[PDB]
Amino acid sequence: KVFGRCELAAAMKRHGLDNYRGYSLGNWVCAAKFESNFNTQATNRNTDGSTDYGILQINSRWWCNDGRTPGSRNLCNIPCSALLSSDITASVNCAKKIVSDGNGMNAWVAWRNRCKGTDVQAWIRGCRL
Numbered sequence: 001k002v003f004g005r006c007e008l009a010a011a012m013k014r015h016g017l018d019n020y021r022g023y024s025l026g027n028w029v030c031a032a033k034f035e036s037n038f039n040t041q042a043t044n045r046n047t048d049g050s051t052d053y054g055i056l057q058i059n060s061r062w063w064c065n066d067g068r069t070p071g072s073r074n075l076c077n078i079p080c081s082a083l084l085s086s087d088i089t090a091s092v093n094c095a096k097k098i099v100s101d102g103n104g105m106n107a108w109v110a111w112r113n114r115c116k117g118t119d120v121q122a123w124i125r126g127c128r129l
């Protein structure tokens, strides 16, 4: 599923991300835009052999089991395929554990490089929330 900007903002707010660990909703929308272009089906291979899945590009090195990442963990206790659903529940619940892991949203290299220190409120401007 390819979300609209405001549709994804509303789904993220309904699932508890607005100000989660102090990150405003625009941060999460900005991260999703640069990670997946709001596409739940997005997949990308990493140099280490792990893969990033879904709207927030959650990695198989730590967070999910894809059956092909050796010496990895599954800290969200999910198959990676769950992160590709039109229903963003698994991605949201796994993002909350990631952002709680010590480095905040710096866990998402795209957030640190494209959203941190920018006017992220712009990502939710005009949305009925």
Ligand code: NA
Pocket (backbone or CB within 6 Å): 034, 035, 036, 044, 052, 057, 110
């Ligand atoms: Na990415």
Ligand code: NA
Pocket (backbone or CB within 6 Å): 060, 061, 062, 063, 064, 065, 066, 069, 072, 073, 074
């Ligand atoms: Na894994």
Ligand SMILES: [Rh+]
Pocket (backbone or CB within 6 Å): 011, 014, 015, 087, 088, 089
């Ligand atoms: Rh939902």
Ligand SMILES: [Rh+]
Pocket (backbone or CB within 6 Å): 128, 129
């Ligand atoms: Rh509202």
